[PDB]
Design a protein around this ligand. Structure first.
Ligand SMILES: CCCCCCCCCCCCCCCCCC(=O)O[C@@H](COC(=O)CCCCCCCCCCCCCCC)COP(=O)(O)OC[C@H](O)CO
Ligand SMILES: CCCCCCCCCCCCCCCCCC(=O)O[C@@H](COC(=O)CCCCCCCCCCCCCCC)COP(=O)(O)OC[C@H](O)CO
Ligand SMILES: CCCCCCCCCCCCCCCCCC(=O)O[C@@H](COC(=O)CCCCCCCCCCCCCCC)COP(=O)(O)OC[C@H](O)CO
Ligand code: NA
Ligand code: NA
Lengths: 519, 523, 519
């Protein structure tokens, strides 16, 4: 119930230093972020690439290897959220602004420029390589972190923290030791920079749309603060205000506005061409899955390092930053699901929705390029979605609807992050003081502004460089959550009696052999 | 039993509407079919491609899930057919003219012309594409349709109708009024138009068999009528008459005769080159399985649209239209057989026989092409097999036995279609009227003839256009069968007791949560 | 206790005839080997390739199947060796000089020359095709043979022979009769020529290692005779006097030191960029490489396959008879599923990391420009690589000591096993019977090395393919024999007995119903 000042103070100091450094000295901060990315991507990029696909293997195995039957709670327990409602709150908190910002930019960018090891103007690899970054590899990080927290919190009954998930690996003395503190600090620093990156990427696109919709003429440096201040003041209140409906209501407004914007483009846009990419993109994704997972800085004659540092290694570092707080939320909602249900509900359902979104939006953008109409414009990634919407008839009203979607796809996740950061500040208490939950909401905004204003002309690169550095320390925490998780699952109360017999029989068999050899 | 006159008449009107429209207005029928094919392929082409692979995935998780152990019948039941004789009737009924007609022409056509997104003269792609069209995607449609009927008929004791398999979705009342009747005429129309495509294709190859054997000099239009007339008598006599050991003897004769012609080509032909292709075709098939499963009209920079309508979408429509009556037959001969045992038996064993078949005949044809001696000839698909056989020693005598095998590969499947069609008009009576079984056999021959005389030179094109159109309505019945199947399986007696406790506990937990939220909500 | 002279004599005649033939008439022996090699590769090339992949499929399906839980021994038994000590002795005994000889020659050869159907200078396929030959296809033959012997010996109580694992097919009378003596003769000839092929290659690399290290001025045919004789006594001494566990652990520690040396002082980061780039490519092309016959590349693959793929498959099949009975001996009380995974995966993991450190470090040198190819002799690639790295003059000698233990641990277990197939499956075989087979292996090793002249590699390869062809069909027949007696387990007869009775009634009812209705 205390404030665990051994976790708040180290996390505040790093956050405050970034705000002072980024805002105070823009030139120095930008150079360090560029230098830090090169060292991280060069000497550590293999870790993201190698372990990014180990998570997918590890999770699928855990969902079939004798543990899919265990239940995240007590035996005979039942889920407190109906399946349809349960799925809605996980994709709303799981996804922020990644289907809006990159829904059109990414599949279109790979169509024009191409991907390393391939040619340009290829719709098979433009779409398949987009599904690679948004279907299984990213959502397998949430399952691993969410499952480790869900099991320890419910089956074993420990505090709601990320250190407690490591009790098997570092014992109970280490959960209160220097390691327990460090694992918890890295979960807040990752979350603050993980959300601040998506706040900065959503403030750019909301401001970009206003120029399109002409509510405003063009974004300015003060406009970004205005958008961030409104977005910050929205999720900060929605998290810590009893008035209004909870996250289960907002999580349902997301899936309604998102389906409104997807159905509009699907119907108005090239329906038949969109429907043809759905099998072609899934078929190309499954045949190229391992070929794409084996792409490193050594691929394409060693020239793919620059591409990976902006597309793959950024996404993997981005999703890992959101895992510490999207794992804790996913744990809260399950409370009764079996390991198989949790794994297959997180891996397959969010992956199916992301497949349809990118074919409706990525397919429309690519189809426009083939036809002759090009929504690329000046190339800015923020302006591409609204250039597509405005091309379609009736897009003026939908351009406005896309803003509410942009704002409401970050509020659902940002508010959950604050309430999840608040519980780490205390000793895993579900109820968090509204002041610490509001204090962390401001921290993401202060970082979100710092990464945007400091970036200047190129604010995307600065927002992406800092995320990769802030997520590298927590990449290893996720790797060590695979070993901690298996130790917990093996030492289950429904396996202790069976494991004791094997320990006894194994000891005797060794004793018989050593004595038998002498005789 | 009482004839289902509410299904015979609406289905018979479609059949007779096409016959008069085809013989009398050949000029206007071909135009409509070609225009209909364009409308279907352009708009619903993705459906065949997208859901042709969901069937493979759906019937693999079903076999691998907890439903695999279920037994198609009571618990403690045991199959009534020797597992060897179960396969023989499974393959004999499930396959007809296909292997004989496209055994040589498909692998050779892809070797010369190539496939979209690939170069010509590529043996790996040529062989790994004909295995795609004939191994797992086609036989996964039979398993889904056959399993839905087998489960409802035996495990749940409903009537043997395609409507009854939808009771989980539309209910016992929906399955009777108007949706059930629609699903029961779309199944008869698909069966009539799916078996008429095989009859037309078989008559074309039989006519070429007599030209190559020189028994007939020139196949005119009055000999095709002679061939179809003999064939339609063959499977009407077998279907209705109680003598002759209709099945388990003519189905066992098909393996004996099918293997005799495969062994002849294997040993007389390039045996070592055939065996070198066998591991290369399977390896290439599994490597490119998902590249071919995602080949839509957007492939080859938009050039694949015309290719798919001739090979991929035609096959998926050809197999979709045969699944109403193959699935119904596979249910009867698979009583007491578990779900996993049923799915693996259908998916794997028939897929293995096809793989060996196309290596011996596709490999021999491709090997000849490389050497310099080409059996392509003029390029008619109906004359390739006999061009291959006559290029080997002893082919003259062995070309006559290919025609007999060609006929017997239709009779074993056409007689089971007429019998199943009669059952669909007897409210599911296993033994239907002889004059309803025979009437439906004559209907199949009438349409098969109408699509040959109407086409003229492009007889094959007219047969493929109509099959795709007739099998489009049933594409959605198969999509719906895989939604009513999981509900049927889920609501099983063995799982019913456990489900009730889980629902009961879930309601309490949900109610407990909402109350706690209210208690915290107030203050 | 008897020596089964009716199996020893036929084995000796084939072994002795080869020694006289090769030494007596080198020209005739070399000409016959080339003629026989072409005859087998053309006619039976598909058999090695077609059934090479069926072994991988067959073993995974058996571990997946219900049989996976059957325990090799009595119900509720426990293993005699710790999992780490059991793993260490399976790899040391199952791997001879293959990793040392081809650690740098194979991945580097494919980078320069390419592979059938692919362009040259491709690091992706150089490493992906290198792991094809050393990860799953090879180690799956060991599990098929090791499992058939382990199951029949322990869970059925039959004598520890290769013929005793065939009684489900040939019957008890057949195994005692003639077919089961030819299976024992072929099981001896294959292991004599397989172990002599690796002894020949080991002597070439040690002979080249001495010349490179300046210990011996030049490599002379009379110098190699000294190496083989010295190597002959080491493994004969270990299998006779009063061991395996100690030397198998000295293998792993000493080998891991050599791998750590190259890893640390080589391009560490570039090595790690290939760890996921080779696993991704391996899984991508697994079925493209698994379906590579002589028909691939339009007849150009026939000459390549006989040198790389069909050679390895015949080389690993040669070692299966005696690695099968060694794997069975130490795997008492392990479940079938635990046996398959402990053999297929862990040795594949060590091989995958071995070639990345050594194949990667040799390919980067090619890319940089400093090529270690030199003259191009396969036996000099390793010592070119080590000398390039700093400190490779002391680590270039430990490679030769590591070439001794690698062969000695496997050769020590070959003689012990070869002396058991002659004494009616008696574990404690006569000391002189092991010695007799120990020097018969050395005589064959020299015969192929001397008769080969300048091209000693081709003579060793052409004769192991012919010697391992008869035993290709014994492994193909072990899949059927293994399935026959796995089904007929004590924990399935009651279930199988009831099912057959019910099925017979169902057939009887149908036949009676048919008569009633047919009338
Ligand atoms: C050169 C590269 C070649 C290799 C390519 C990569 C291969 C990766 C393979 C990874 C194997 C993982 C080993 C664990 C297998 C999982 C399945 C399993 O063990 O299931 C058993 C139960 O599970 C266990 O007891 C052990 C499971 C492992 C514990 C979890 C550890 C994490 C493993 C994650 C996978 C590895 C991820 C790393 C990357 C592959 C038995 O299952 P069952 O009894 O429920 O079903 C069979 C039924 O009875 C008969 O039909
Ligand atoms: C996420 C998809 C987007 C693409 C990205 C991922 C790449 C594709 C991966 C393909 C995964 C498909 C298979 C995953 C489904 C797992 C199903 C499973 O594990 O078990 C269930 C499966 O059982 C089924 O119901 C059938 C599932 C059908 C799955 C078919 C998958 C089709 C996907 C193919 C796409 C087509 C692509 C076109 C060609 C490119 C059991 O549930 P149940 O509803 O039967 O009830 C169980 C129990 O009673 C509880 O009450
Ligand atoms: C690349 C070339 C590969 C070619 C062939 C490889 C496959 C052959 C090896 C696998 C078969 C060995 C069978 C070993 C005995 C296990 C039998 C067994 O116990 O059944 C279990 C394991 O058996 C299997 O699942 C068999 C799987 C066969 C795998 C076939 C793979 C080859 C096909 C690949 C796809 C390509 C298709 C052909 C090309 C068109 C599963 O069922 P269950 O025992 O749990 O319950 C029984 C129930 O009644 C069901 O019968
Ligand atoms: Na959200
Ligand atoms: Na047939």
């Amino acid at each position: 119930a205390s404030l665990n000042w051994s976790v708040i103070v180290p996390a505040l100091v790093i956050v405050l230093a970034t705000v002072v450094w980024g805002i105070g000295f823009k030139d120095s901060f930008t150079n360090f972020a560029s230098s830090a990315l090169s060292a991280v991507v060069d000497n550590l990029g293999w870790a993201f690439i190698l372990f990014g696909t180990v998570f997918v293997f590890f999770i699928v195995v855990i969902a079939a290897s004798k543990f899919g039957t265990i239940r995240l709670g007590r035996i005979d327990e039942a889920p407190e959220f109906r399946t349809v409602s349960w799925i809605s709150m996980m994709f709303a908190a799981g996804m922020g602004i990644g289907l809006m910002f990159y829904g059109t930019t990414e599949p279109l960018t790979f169509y024009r420029n191409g991907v390393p090891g391939h040619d340009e103007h290829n719709v098979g690899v433009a779409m398949s390589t987009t599904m690679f970054h948004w279907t299984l590899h990213p959502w397998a990080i949430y399952a691993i972190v969410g499952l480790a927290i869900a099991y320890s919190t419910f089956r074993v009954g420990r505090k709601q923290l990320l250190s407690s998930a490591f009790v098997p690996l570092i014992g109970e003395k280490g959960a209160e030791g220097w390691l327990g503190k460090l694992i918890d600090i890295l979960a807040i620093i990752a979350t603050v920079f993980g959300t601040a990156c998506s706040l900065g990427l959503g403030a750019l696109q909301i401001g970009a749309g206003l120029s399109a919709a002409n509510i405003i003429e063009d974004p300015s440096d003060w406009t970004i603060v205005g958008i961030v201040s409104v977005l910050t003041l929205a999720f900060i209140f929605s998290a810590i205000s009893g008035v209004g409906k909870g996250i289960q209501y907002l999580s349902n407004a997301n899936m309604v506005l998102a389906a409104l914007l997807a159905i509009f483009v699907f119907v108005v846009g090239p329906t038949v061409s969109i429907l043809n990419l759905l099998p072609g993109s899934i078929g190309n994704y499954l045949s190229n899955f391992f070929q794409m997972a084996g792409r490193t800085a050594m691929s394409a004659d060693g020239t793919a390092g620059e591409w990976l540092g902006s597309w793959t290694i950024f996404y993997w570092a981005w999703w890992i930053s959101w895992s510490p707080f999207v794992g804790m939320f996913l744990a809260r909602i399950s409370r009764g699901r079996s390991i198989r249900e949790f794994i297959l509900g997180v891996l397959l359902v969010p992956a199916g929705v992301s497949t349809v979104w990118f074919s409706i939006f990525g397919g429309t953008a690519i189809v426009f390029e083939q036809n002759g109409e090009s929504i690329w414009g000046d190339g800015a990634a923020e302006e591409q979605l609204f250039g597509l919407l405005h091309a379609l008839p009736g897009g003026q009203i939908m351009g406005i609807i896309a803003m509410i979607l942009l704002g409401t796809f970050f509020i659902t996740s940002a508010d959950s992050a604050s309430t999840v950061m608040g519980t780490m500040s205390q000793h895993g208490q579900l109820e968090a003081n509204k002041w610490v939950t509001a204090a962390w909401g401001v921290a993401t905004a202060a970082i979100g502004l710092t990464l945007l204003l400091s970036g200047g002309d190129n604010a995307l690169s600065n927002l992406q460089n800092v995320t990769i550095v802030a997520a590298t320390p927590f990449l290893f925490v996720v790797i060590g959550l695979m070993f901690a998780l298996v130790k917990d699952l093996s030492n289950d109360v429904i396996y202790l009696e069976y494991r004791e017999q094997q320990r006894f029989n194994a000891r005797l068999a060794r004793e018989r052999r050593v004595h038998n050899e002498h005789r």
